[PDB]
């Protein structure tokens, strides 16, 4: 029998994962503060990482990577990219972003394009620095708003892509073969959060990969793999390997895996941009069962075995 | 030359003291009968090894040490052991019944009956020192004597020798080799009482030593002998600068200067490499780069913690064996590229390096193989606070129900001393967090 | 980077390598504490013998 | 560190005689009192239970007490009866009559000072005295009434010494008299306050083990006391043989007793062995561990799954791999975490002794401070209240000067003890 403990009751993903483990008949959920667990589905904040790996006779796994917050916070991510040579100053795939605390770097580069007549529309989206910058004082990230988003028709609809990524204890990087397209239902005027019409062109403003592939073929004579996903795999891999020496648990007394959500936006010229990385993501409703079983298969059962894959291994 | 006095309190301190002084005798060429033919100054001298040894007219070299335990069993084996002649009978002080794993009994009821005698025996050692720099105190967090009596002695030493440095070698409790359920209580009480009276404390987690013996020495069930002999190698590395000629860490004062920028944050992490089994037939000798890089592996540290998720305030590299500075600097440049080593912004990112050419000495019939080079890293990193969080959490679990507290209150202690000690621990954890993030 | 204060001797050498630069109670109160626990311990003992006498 | 042993009453002297019989064989001491053994380990800690007499003769530091001469004349007649010091037989003539009041207040009051004289003489010749070991039953009059009176007297003279008892609890399946619940309830009120550790030896459990597990159809007291003697030898293994823990009565109390009144232990043993029947297959380290935690090996008739373990001490005897014992003991805690309190970390302690008990190559002794012991006290309480609500059989006690209020107090105190075990079961 294996032991596990739940410490984030709002995790739709790991509530699904925990019910899967119990229903295997070889896992038993413990009290939330029982130290003798094999697996910890931990809280999102102040996870007691310093307490893992000190139980004699117990192999301990945790569904979070200590130090992964540096990729999953806007101010730190923007810092991490510019300051790290792996992501190499201004790489091609991250919008120009700046840390301004509620300033000098913004004015120098931005004002060049307000003079130069190239669209100066950073982002709460304005074109006047004072309008938005003085507003935020009522930390924040000032990012260029890409003014030429990819046209999606019928409907002239802006969109964003979410790919779920699982990193196991051995730092294998797994890209779930099923990504989600979150769609804006109303046309664009020269935000796609599903939290903010709905249902007109496709169910619940969620378009899938089999469908978006055919749109790209029929409309644009191209494949999803060739046009977008190749750029996505490169951005995921570059991000997660840059921080691998900082967060890997290869030689640690406890082990980490963690599921991420990557956010991309595709421009008119079919260039892929990184929006944000989310350390606690929620799967699409249709895809929950497939992904949560893949987590158990490759993240949990790999360490705790019992007695065709759904992932793409991003090689490094 | 300024003399240093070693005080070994409780079972753990005494048995670790045995292995340390045994190792010192081998390193300095002193026989179990106290004679050192190496010493051509007969009856005295001011050599570097005279920091730890005094001389008699008969040429016997005597450790400047005192062993104290509230119960006679452990120290009696020292009186009858291989090094019987090494120590003067007055140097070994024993009580009659121990503290029963109770800090209060060690500190208050039983400890108060022997404290005056111990200080007088210590004073006899001090009066044969031309310039006493301070004390090195070996004790456990967990035991009643190692916890309660040590804090009592440290308070009186602060009063009597207020100008002298006090360093600790503290054994942090681990369930793999545990002796008592109330060890988290004893740990918090003794740490709180001793915090301002200690200038530098080297914590050794019994869990780390245990796994190192299993993993790297292939001993399935390590005994106290296995753990202590490995611990003495680390201790010998830390104290070698006091006993041999060198420019780095030559007095106890320098340990605080190099390792301790803030007084409360005075627990440096120790990492030792390489640990190789004597029974390993074929072994490939590791280079300067390999052993230095091992200093940043948590599996070689004396406490298991992640320095990547903390900040450094100081870093010392103590080498023994075939090591030259150009190899050290080339290795450091290499490690800096590949590892997460981040300092606080008000400290320079630099290493203090000391090299002793004679390689580590090993006891014949021991578990460690002879190596051609070794290193002990002393880093002051906030990551060591993980051990404080682990201990404090265990304290909270029991204390929330006042489990076993009646044993302490039964000896005169008050419930408020528990909460007072825990608040100081909570403050210590917060100091570490502010510096670390 | 910069190697400073190299000192050598026949036993070894020591130096510093810098990669980047930076950006008590008295004996009196001891006895007051110890005797205050002693009176509590003696009081609790006297309560025992009083209870036994009943 | 020496211990003073006291056996009182019929039951106390019997299991007491068996205990000296068993451990003397383990230490190589014959009925003459002479050591004829093959190892120095037998003598390393022999001073704990034996005095040294002229010509290297070993004498148990034991005091035999009864208000009736008969059972003690049996002890002298017994196999090891001549080993005991003759001056340590202290007996009355009338007897207690299964009356707690007679043992505590009247008949026992006359003899108590004579016993303390022997206890004092034994104590004076001790270099460092840990405390006292008493064997008695709680259902009779002498061991119950006078045994607790002795415990109170000894605590008065030795308030800083450990008091430890082996207390046999009454069961209607092994019952001499209907008043045993009265005697037991009055005795538990004393033990809750004047002992540091009490091993609860339930006659119901001893009977059930003999009937169900050992397939003994009509078990005698000799069958029952074979189980008690094996348990007492195992429970005292760390005292009698050298170990890494450097173990004593106080450290056991400090580590096992989180709250002063919850000091009533559930002993366990494995392999469960019938008298004379030889065991040819030695057990495996996994088998010992599963049996020792099995409810069917407990000597108190309680279900450990009905409560939670506050602390546990496990003693393994024989030549076995300590790694396997560690793995196996770690396996039980990790497998059954729910029955160990989380607010006492590392509350299970394991010890190993190379010397095995006679007739076995592998043996395991279990000592648990479980909140499930409230079931035993609830059972005594229910039997007590059944008679007390009608004031039945009270005249036996009010005839000796006792008042009803003392019964109400003892009833109330035991129900307080039950509620305290209940409190930490849900904590
Ligand atoms: N590394 C190491 N740890 C030890 C040794 N002896 C005991 N310990 C540890 O020390 C703690 C118990 O402290 P002890 O030194 O045994 O107790 P004490 O200081 O003699 O005090 P008393 O309770 O009065 O016996 C436990 O955590 C043990 O794991 C030893 O020789 N080496
Ligand atoms: N440079 C940019 N150009 C165009 N649109 C942008 C943009 N930066 C962000 N957006 C849009 O803002 C929307 C939401 O903002 P943001 O990227 O900060 O959070 P998010 O998309 O990851 C949802 P959540 O914050 O709840 O996890 C995205 O859908 C994106 O379309
Ligand atoms: C008196 O005879 C024993 C004495 C001791 C003993 O002195 C002791 C010392 N330290 C501990 C413990 C440390 N942590 C624990 C957790 C649960 C139980 C005990 C401990 N016990 C232990 C025994 O059994 C292992 C004994 O045999 C019954
Ligand atoms: N195991 C065991 N139990 C006994 C023995 N004799 C009596 N008992 C139990 O002890 C209780 C009677 O107490 P007893 O010791 O005989 O009375 P006392 O002599 O006045 O102390 C009953 O519950 C009996 O079941 C015995 O020899 N061996
Ligand atoms: Ca000399
Ligand atoms: Mg001790
Ligand atoms: Mg009878």
PDB file of C-alpha atoms and ligand atoms in Angstrom, chain B residues 36 39-47 49-50 55 61, ligand 5:
ATOM      1  CA  UNK B  36      55.403  12.622  21.737  1.00  0.00           C
ATOM      2  CA  UNK B  39      58.327  17.122  20.544  1.00  0.00           C
ATOM      3  CA  UNK B  40      61.981  18.034  21.043  1.00  0.00           C
ATOM      4  CA  UNK B  41      61.037  20.753  23.530  1.00  0.00           C
ATOM      5  CA  UNK B  42      60.699  18.567  26.623  1.00  0.00           C
ATOM      6  CA  UNK B  43      58.422  19.716  29.437  1.00  0.00           C
ATOM      7  CA  UNK B  44      56.823  22.600  27.552  1.00  0.00           C
ATOM      8  CA  UNK B  45      56.675  24.864  24.540  1.00  0.00           C
ATOM      9  CA  UNK B  46      54.436  27.235  22.605  1.00  0.00           C
ATOM     10  CA  UNK B  47      53.996  25.221  19.399  1.00  0.00           C
ATOM     11  CA  UNK B  49      49.843  21.727  18.890  1.00  0.00           C
ATOM     12  CA  UNK B  50      50.330  23.130  22.400  1.00  0.00           C
ATOM     13  CA  UNK B  55      53.288  19.186  28.681  1.00  0.00           C
ATOM     14  CA  UNK B  61      51.304  15.324  26.600  1.00  0.00           C
TER      15      UNK B  61
HETATM   16 CA1  LIG E   5      57.242  21.126  23.463  1.00  0.00          CA
END
